[PDB]
């Protein structure tokens, strides 16, 4: 990502001023610049590189190269999750039916926040299953929006 930010943040980790940080700080550095890797992923990224594998510290250039060759896996750790959205629906689903009426959904989407229009909602609903009761399974709805 933005080398300007990445580079600045790198300096605050490089207290010895030796142009490199402890290999054990790699996870913290990657979290500080915006990613969310497990310890497993961080270790797998390092071992996948014989040159870095047994190194004691890592420079900015080495870390930048590591990011670029694992960019997709790292970007994926910041992807929106279904669970992040379900809260917008759950607050209003008092009985936890897991369903929202098409009327309430259109209201929420066109009346609040960065309002969508009826015409955007109409287009979206073509890909959405509506009950004979006019109800929509909201986790399924969120999963579909997020898929791809």
């Amino acid at each position: 990502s933005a080398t300007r930010a990445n580079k600045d943040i790198f300096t605050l980790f490089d207290k010895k001023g030796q142009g490199a940080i402890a290999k054990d700080s790699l996870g913290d550095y990657l979290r500080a610049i915006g990613y969310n890797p497990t310890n497993q992923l961080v270790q797998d990224i390092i071992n996948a590189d014989s040159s870095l594998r047994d190194a004691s510290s890592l420079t900015l250039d080495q870390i930048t190269g590591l990011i670029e060759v694992n960019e997709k896996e790292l970007d994926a750790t910041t992807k929106a999750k279904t669970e992040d959205f379900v809260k917008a629906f759950q607050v209003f689903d008092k009985e936890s039916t897991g369903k929202v009426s098409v009327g309430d959904l259109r209201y929420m989407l066109t009346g609040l926040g960065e309002k969508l229009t009826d015409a955007e909602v109409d287009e979206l609903l073509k890909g959405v299953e509506v009950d004979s009761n006019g109800e929509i399974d909201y986790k399924k709805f969120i999963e579909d929006v997020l898929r791809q």
Binding site: A80, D84, F85, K87, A88, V91, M108, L109, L112, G113, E114, K115, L116, E120, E123, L124, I142, V145, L146, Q148
Partner: peptide
Amino acid sequence: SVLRTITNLQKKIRKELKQRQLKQE
């Protein structure tokens, strides 16, 4: 946190919509 969550969802919908449009043209 509720209005922000709804706002983020609206953003993802809008991207979903533009994606669909790219496929027709």
